[PDB]
Design a protein around this nucleic acid. Sequence first.
RNA 1: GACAAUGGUAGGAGAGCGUUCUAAGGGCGUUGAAGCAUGAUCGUAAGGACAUGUGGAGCGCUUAGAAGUGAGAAUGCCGGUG
RNA 2: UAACUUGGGAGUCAGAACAUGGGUGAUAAGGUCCGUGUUCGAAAGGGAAACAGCCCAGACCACCAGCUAAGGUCCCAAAAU
RNA 3: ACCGAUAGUGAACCAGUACCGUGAGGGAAAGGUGAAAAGCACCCCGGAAGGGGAGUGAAAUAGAACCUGAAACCGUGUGCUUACAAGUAGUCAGAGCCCGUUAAUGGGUGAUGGCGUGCCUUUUGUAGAAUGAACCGGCGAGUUACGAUUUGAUGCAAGGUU
Lengths: 100, 50, 48, 146, 111, 116, 143
Amino acid sequence: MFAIIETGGKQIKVEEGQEIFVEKLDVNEGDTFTFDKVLFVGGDSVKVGAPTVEGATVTATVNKQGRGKKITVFTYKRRKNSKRKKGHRQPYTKLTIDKI
Amino acid sequence: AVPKRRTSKTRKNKRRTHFKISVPGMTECPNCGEYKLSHRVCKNCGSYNG
Amino acid sequence: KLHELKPAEGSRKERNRVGRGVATGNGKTSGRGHKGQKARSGGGVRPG
Amino acid sequence: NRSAVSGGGRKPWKQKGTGRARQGTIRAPQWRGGGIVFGPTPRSYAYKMPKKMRRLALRSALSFKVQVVDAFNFEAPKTKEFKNVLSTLKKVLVVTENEDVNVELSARNIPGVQVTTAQGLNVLDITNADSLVITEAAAKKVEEVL
Amino acid sequence: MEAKAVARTIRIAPRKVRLVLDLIRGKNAAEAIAILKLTNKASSPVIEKVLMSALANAEHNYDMNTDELVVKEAYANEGPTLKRFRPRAQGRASAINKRTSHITIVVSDGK
Amino acid sequence: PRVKGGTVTRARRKKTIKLAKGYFGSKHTLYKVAKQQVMKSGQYAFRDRRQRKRDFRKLWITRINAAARQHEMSYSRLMNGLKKAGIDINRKMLSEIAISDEKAFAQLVTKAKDAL
Amino acid sequence: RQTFMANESNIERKWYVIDAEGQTLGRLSSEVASILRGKNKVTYTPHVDTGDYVIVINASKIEFTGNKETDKVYYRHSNHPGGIKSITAGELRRTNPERLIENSIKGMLPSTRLGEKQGKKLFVYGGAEHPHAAQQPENYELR
RNA sequence: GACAAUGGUAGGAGAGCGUUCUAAGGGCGUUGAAGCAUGAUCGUAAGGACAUGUGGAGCGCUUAGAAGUGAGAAUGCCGGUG
RNA sequence: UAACUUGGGAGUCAGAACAUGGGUGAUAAGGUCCGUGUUCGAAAGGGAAACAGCCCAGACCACCAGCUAAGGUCCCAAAAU
RNA sequence: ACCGAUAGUGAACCAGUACCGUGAGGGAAAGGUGAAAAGCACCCCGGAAGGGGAGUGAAAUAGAACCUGAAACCGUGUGCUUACAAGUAGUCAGAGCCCGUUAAUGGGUGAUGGCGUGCCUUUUGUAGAAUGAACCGGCGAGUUACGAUUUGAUGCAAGGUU
């Protein structure tokens, strides 16, 4: 009994009791959150998929809301005195999938 | 000629892999009680007895 | 007040300081372009 | 700079056949022990500004102090008497008339107290102070000046 | 326990000494002195001195049997080099490095 | 006043030598080679993020094509079956669905052939 | 995120046996190389050989097309000055067919450290008898 | 909110970090300052903290001011060392 | 949705290939000189095996999402034996 | 709002000295124990040097090569890995093995797979076989005085200003 949820312009194969990591959602720490973009459900249970299954949904607890590891964005043009350094901590939110 | 490129301190140690010196090939003297070098006169006390 | 001083907004500016790095914009050649009679210490031809 | 450091005036090597870099003297900047390219020179730092702005800065300093005792009476310079006079009333600026040479003496040893006269009112003196103690006469003399 | 002996500013190159020190490292203390007496190298006598001082320090200050003392460690470290000059030809002149070494030996019962 | 450069050069050069560890030989000891290799590392990482996206796209297509051939289809004929039967899931999910459930991927292949 | 990668304990490997009689050399070699690298299976990952072991038999019976028997000179250089050697496919089909098919297939696998592992999973015999009875080889037909 | 823009050499414009010192204010420090070593830390960068060892007596912090104010390139100079 | 004016500040005055209209050369040259255009200069990404200038296309940053461009779908090597 | 031992005088030190030159003349490097010498009595190895204890001391890894004590460089030990492999030495993916932090999608190593011809300078154009750099550390390049010009701020205003 898994599913495929469309969350942030990306699909995710999700089973229960699993912790998942998604782009930033507006909710705060420790909250429920219902996924509606579910395109395909069921493993050993059933195999039903439409553009969106439209009968099934998912519910997750908003476990945490943070920022990934700072990747430094460095790059340069050789012999032409041009270089550029940036930083980036892409923000994420981690969720526990409570029910399907 | 002259070296075209300075030698790393890896290639150096590889080339010095074989810069060992073996032990002499010694034994113990049955008379002197100590180590002599085989087929030689005993350093410590005297005799050869071969 | 002598430990909170504030010159009038817009009066002071920090001088331009060339020849210190390539991220300022005036580092390598220091605003003079490449070779020539005017990229040489000693000025160009006299004015006029 | 190059003109002042001792020695030099001799090209060390020939510039052409050595193999070393071409140098001109041992007292050039890139060396050690010779030559400072720019830097300190004995030069003044003061400047001026118009009379009216000077007077307006002094008026603004006194204005922010406002944002006054009788005459001082010290026969002998006795710093404890002055400390009492300051306690009954610690960045004090005690402004007097022309000069009383027993109040400057009574007060120049106390840390945080500065004494002066109505003809000698700085702006650094004023703005450095937490209080002004001006006499009845010095108030009027500065109202006459400014 | 452990007993060390250090000989400092021994006037021999350190990689003319590590040749011999790569032998007696790990050995018993008896065969160590046997080797260090029988070898041809010029580093043997000074290392004989140092290893015997290590064993004597053991048996006098720490009082551990001079029968089971195995050379736990032995190593040379660089020292202050005397830098000299040699006349080459055509007016040139080349440096010379009369280098030194610090010879440390550590004998321990292993208990 | 005089301002002699001290413990400001050292700080940033140390910061650059920490940043290059695991490098062969003088790359992790010396500064003028460690700096060059750190710059090359930054450029390579910038490039390799985009190419990482491309690599996994290739791998997903490869495994979907390996699954469909066991079901008498192609990658192309199948992926046209989908999007013409009815819009469906992407390549990563579809590949690892072919991996986990061999029993729903064939569901999809029948529903795709039904797109004719 | 989630993308299954093949490990040493995930992988399986199978034994196939393909008649090389009547097949064009390259039309068969492509199929075989596909099998060898291992992308007939869904657990394809690049950095490991998830492919299979293959036993090509009847290598003295492959067919060329057109004037390729007398043409199609194989060359090889001996790294000595002026020493280059040559052999035509007709003379390599009777003298050593088990090198004909091997060279065809191994030119279609990558030249990497893992491509040589896969390169030495190919077992080619000129004949109908292969000594790998103890391996449970499977039939295989050209897809 | 919505839309739009954000490759860049010579070059033009803006905003900043960091070092030494000075004034003022407020602080830390032999119950351990500066410095040095290590670290898996915070910032969009220059960079800023924190913790432990080492060290033994001075240093931050805010706001202004002044500069001998930032080094990888000069067959650069001096020392050390390959 | 630019344009001009008046001001402060510059850099540039060694250009290259490609298509094209010509001169010169020999309907030689990756030649040389001019008109028009594009790209490189100062431009990374994909294709041309590799390859500044050729075809596609202009990188604010992250993503293990989707659609196409030149060019391609037997294997190396992604997609039609 | 001058330097703090490569600085400041060439010279913080018995320096115009070592040294160099026939000569006129040129010319360096060289600072720091500790609050106090209290500067290591005695024992052991050794020919001595040098050590190991034992003491002085607040500290001796402050023992006169004496405040801290960086890097290049030289070693000893050990966790992961490597003898069929073609390497600008990294980067992305990634098993396996070993650990355990500023506790957060951890750290070290790295079988293997994809991509990938250093940096400056000069050039129409450089991986370039064009230049330059052995490596490490320190020092080392748009400054000041006076005028002109335009811009921002401030002060007054047919006046402004010394």
